[PDB]
């Protein structure tokens, strides 16, 4: 539908992704592309029980602080995260498309250091991805995600606004936290593809990067960012709630 | 090795409910999908992910999955729902297709209705007289028509035509025409059509006499 | 060279809930096929058109019949229309009940 | 359709992406006559990596040509059991249910070529007033056709009966050869059933004499 | 000119038993009228669906047919059913004729 310097939007990327996947590990994540297990069949709850469900910690006061620091160890399987800022990534660590979010899903391909597109399936050593994460009002995308060649997901995005207390009572919301801030909106504090703590911006490979959301249902949403309009479909679960915020 | 089993065949009467079960080991944690294959046709999807049903399939089809069995329940079965049904699942990075189950809907017997039409006056003027015996809305297909001309059997000089089965009702139709020459027809008194077919306690005779009216 | 539509008149009385039957017989026509239509070609309930049968001397024959409620015969009327292409012939006949007197 | 010679190879083709986002995973399914379905492998247009089933690991090879936007599977060394209808499904990317089953393709193979098997048929050892007994030499489990049966180098032809070949359920053939001869000449004359089958260069001879009854 | 049929039965070979298969053959010699019917009964119990028949054509100087009926049994099935019998029905015969053989004693 359209192509550009990086944004191969319109849902049509051609071959410029980096097809460097390794099968030495027997986890067989690549073989898990055809089918997805049930929620309670893959041992999700043990991995999903490490983060506080609804009310994590309360106020953090009015000032919207930015202390991105570094979030580098835990996997981004639940909406808790403090993703760091990534500008470039060697193309020897990517296995599949790198979907990035305007928030509307967008694909970024392999490019030369100087920016010349290269057509080598990312096999070449010099291949590198250039993605300087910047907010939509200043251009580029919030942040985005891919799969590392060993079989583990990755995330990256702009600084997340900081909020917390004193009794080990810190909540660093990377998205939403509507009631816990003076009107924190995804257009400001949004970092990754987590629109709200129980929603996702669905894309063709969503079930592959976050296979603990297989039970999620579909929805069609309309969002305004900056001074433009976005039509999007987001996947939110029907976990007991009132979805009219 | 992973193997799925289903009953070899299931028979149900129209308007009733038939149950088809797919059984395995701890099958409750898999995402099954049901396929309906008619004779000589490519299989089509009838259920995916236990209960979710695609577009174009009637609400009659339904499913469930729990424990060690997955059920495909059909309510208000009719003659159109006769076909092989297969069960699917994924395991150990390999596809498994369950043994085909054949669903056959037994048909009910319908007594034939027999009518006889005497030869037309206009045709009689042309030298040839035609007598037609009709059987419609009858089942099964095996029905025998016998002609009598004043207690005399007729062999040959008779054509038999049959239509195609009706999907909605599963019934046929039969027309038997007897031709004669003008002189021959005029030289007999009582004509009769005899039908022998299942669903009739005794053969039924529909008859008439010529020249009466 | 013949449409030869011959009425198949209904039973003398058959006066009951026993829906009667009537039809038209097309005979000695060729080549196939022929289209048979009822009133204004707008009747489909309880209509049968048996497949053509090969007559003895290389001719074709076909019969069409319709089941109609007994009471309707008094006022309603029926017409059999036959279309034979290689004759470019259309023929209409009225299948009236026998006088029976 | 045309019957493929054994030991050959066959190709089945399915429409494939021309080098852009696909959003579907291809698979191949086979159905032997009235035997259910089976799986062979898969293919993901985005990831050229293929997936092969355990059963057909050593004979299948999945490859695609993006220029022609067509993907095909090559099956080599066909045998009798490889006669079936080949389907080609296309399901969603990561839901694992196959929808839009395309038209099937039928491929047939004609067994193999092997020699016949000869067995004797014991004549009745009981005395008969008429003095007539029937000997028989049976040739079965052979392919292709035809065969010729002769007795005593063909020197005997009075009463020889050779029933026509009848197809067996397996796929091969069967036959029989029978002669009626005087009872009193059973032990003094030698009977040999001569079977020759050129397609296999097989010439087998067999003697037929009344079987024992624990007497001798 | 109606001629009755001559019926013969040949037990299985001593060598086929080594190949895990049994095959009993019932033969009908020259008989004029084409219509005929054979019934395979083992242990006074009929069977059908696992038998085949073949026929030749009456030769020039004759008008009689010859028919055979080969019954195939899977391995270890022949090991039982002591008694076997081939029954033939045809015109001319006073009553249906049965040729039978015990499986034991040759
Ligand atoms: C990786 O990068 C690209 C992948 O884009 C590939 O190389 C080029 O990319 C095309 C495939 O994506 C090659 O195929 C040809 O490209 C043109 C159209 O193909 C594309 O796909 C869609 C159609 O689905 C188009 O809208 C886009 O414009 C893409 O280019 C045509 O060259 C050609 O299409 C047809 O064939 C005839 C025969 O020549 C053409 O004359 C006619 O125009 C017709 O449309 C074909 O589909 C493209 O040629 C190729 N070019 C080069 C220089 O490589 C390779 O896989 C990788 N390498 C490179 C260097 O890009
Ligand atoms: C792509 O990302 C995945 C993310 O899981 C990488 O696996 C990660 O590897 C790290 C670093 O090697 C692991 O933690 C560290 O590994 C070594 C021992 O192997 C040791 O030096 C450290 O003390 C620690 O154990 C970790 O298993 C894993 N990260 C997780 C689970 O969050 C994968 O290797 C990456 N591929 C690359 C960078 O090519
Ligand atoms: C986009 O990517 C990074 C983000 O700053 C910049 O690339 C830098 O490269 C130098 C030399 O290798 C290193 O300091 C780091 O690898 C990168 N700097 C970082 C990660 O801070 C690049 O200049 C950026 N371009 C922009 C923002 O326009
Ligand atoms: C592959 O990586 C190597 C290292 O950068 C480069 O190979 C070059 O090929 C280009 C033409 O594509 C030529 O300029 C030179 O022959 C090679 N080396 C250099 C330093 O230029 C190239 O950058 C990468 N490209 C491909 C297509 O393999
Ligand atoms: C890819 O996997 C192979 C084994 O599948 C193993 O050697 C290694 O992890 C990777 N290959 C290389 C060259 O490192
Ligand atoms: C998943 O299902 C239920 C409900 O979530 C949960 O209690 C259980 O641990 C899992 N398995 C089964 C069989 O219920």
From TrEMBL, chain A:
Q: What is this protein called?
A: Genome polyprotein
Superkingdom of the source species: Viruses
* Disulfide linkage: 21-95, 44-212, 51-78, 86-156, 100-144, 161-189, 173-177, 199-236
Spell out the family assignment given in the record's similarity comment.
Answer: Belongs to the hepacivirus polyprotein family.
Where in the sequence does glycosylation occur per the annotation?
22, 40
Q: Where in the cell is it found?
A: Host cytoplasm; Host endoplasmic reticulum membrane; Host lipid droplet; Host mitochondrion membrane
Q: What is the lineage of its organism?
A: Viruses, Riboviria, Orthornavirae, Kitrinoviricota, Flasuviricetes
Q: Where is the Hepatitis C virus Non-structural protein E2/NS1 domain?
A: 1-237
């Amino acid at each position: 539908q359209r192509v550009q310097l990086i944004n191969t939007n319109g849902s049509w990327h051609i071959n410029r992704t980096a097809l460097n996947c390794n099968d030495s590990l027997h986890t067989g994540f690549l073989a898990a592309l055809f089918y997805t297990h049930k929620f309670n069949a893959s041992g999700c709850p043990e991995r999903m029980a490490h983060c506080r469900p609804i009310d994590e910690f309360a106020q953090g006061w009015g000032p919207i602080t930015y202390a991105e620091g570094h979030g580098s160890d835990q996997r981004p399987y639940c909406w808790h995260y403090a993703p760091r800022q990534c500008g470039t990534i060697p193309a020897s660590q990517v296995c599949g498309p790198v979907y990035c979010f305007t928030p509307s899903p967008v694909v970024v391909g392999t490019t030369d250091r100087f920016g010349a597109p290269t057509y080598t399936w990312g096999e070449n050593e010099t291949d590198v991805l250039i993605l300087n994460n910047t907010r939509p009002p200043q251009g580029n995308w919030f942040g985005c995600t891919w799969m590392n060649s060993t079989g583990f997901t990755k995330t990256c995005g702009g600084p997340p606004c900081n909020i917390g207390g004193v009794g080990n009572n810190t909540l660093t919301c990377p998205t939403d936290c509507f009631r816990k801030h003076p009107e924190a909106t995804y257009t400001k504090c949004g970092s990754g593809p987590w629109l709200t703590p129980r929603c996702l911006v669905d894309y063709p490979y969503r079930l592959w990067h976050y296979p603990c959301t297989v039970n999620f249902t579909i929805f069609k949403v309309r969002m305004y960012v900056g001074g433009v309009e976005h039509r999007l479909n987001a996947a939110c679960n029907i976990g007991h709630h009132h979805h009219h915020h | 090795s992973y193997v799925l089993t289903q009953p070899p065949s299931v028979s149900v009467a129209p308007g009733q409910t038939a149950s088809i079960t797919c059984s395995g080991d701890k099958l409750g944690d898999k995402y099954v999908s049901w396929y309906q294959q008619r004779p000589g046709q490519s299989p089509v999807l009838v259920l995916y992910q236990d209960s979710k049903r695609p577009s174009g399939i009637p609400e009659r089809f339904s499913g469930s999955n729990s424990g060690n069995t997955a059920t495909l329940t059909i309510s208000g079965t009719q003659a159109m729902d006769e076909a092989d049904y297969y069960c699917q699942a994924w395991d150990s990075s390999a596809l498994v297709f369950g043994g085909g189950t054949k669903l056959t809907v037994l048909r009910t017997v319908a007594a034939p209705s027999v009518f006889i039409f005497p030869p037309s006056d206009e045709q009689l003027k042309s030298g040839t007289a035609s007598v037609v015996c009709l059987l419609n809305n009858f089942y099964p297909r095996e029905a025998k028509v016998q002609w009598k001309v004043d207690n005399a059997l007729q062999s040959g000089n008779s054509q038999e035509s049959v239509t195609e089965q009706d999907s909605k009702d599963s019934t046929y139709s039969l027309s038997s025409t007897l031709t004669l020459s003008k002189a021959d027809y005029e030289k007999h008194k009582v004509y009769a059509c005899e039908v022998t077919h299942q669903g009739l306690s005794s053969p039924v005779t529909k008859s008439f006499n010529r020249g009466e009216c | 060279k013949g449409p030869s539509v011959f009425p198949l008149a209904p039973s003398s009385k058959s006066t009951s809930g026993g829906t009667a039957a009537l039809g038209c017989l097309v005979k000695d026509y060729f080549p196939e096929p022929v289209t048979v239509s009822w009133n204004s070609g707008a009747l489909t309930s309880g209509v049968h058109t048996f497949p053509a049968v090969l007559q003895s001397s290389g001719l074709y024959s076909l019969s069409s019949v319709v089941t109609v409620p007994s009471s309707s015969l008094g006022t309603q009327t029926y017409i059999c229309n036959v279309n034979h292409k290689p004759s470019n012939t259309k023929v209409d006949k009225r299948v009236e009940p026998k006088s029976c007197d």
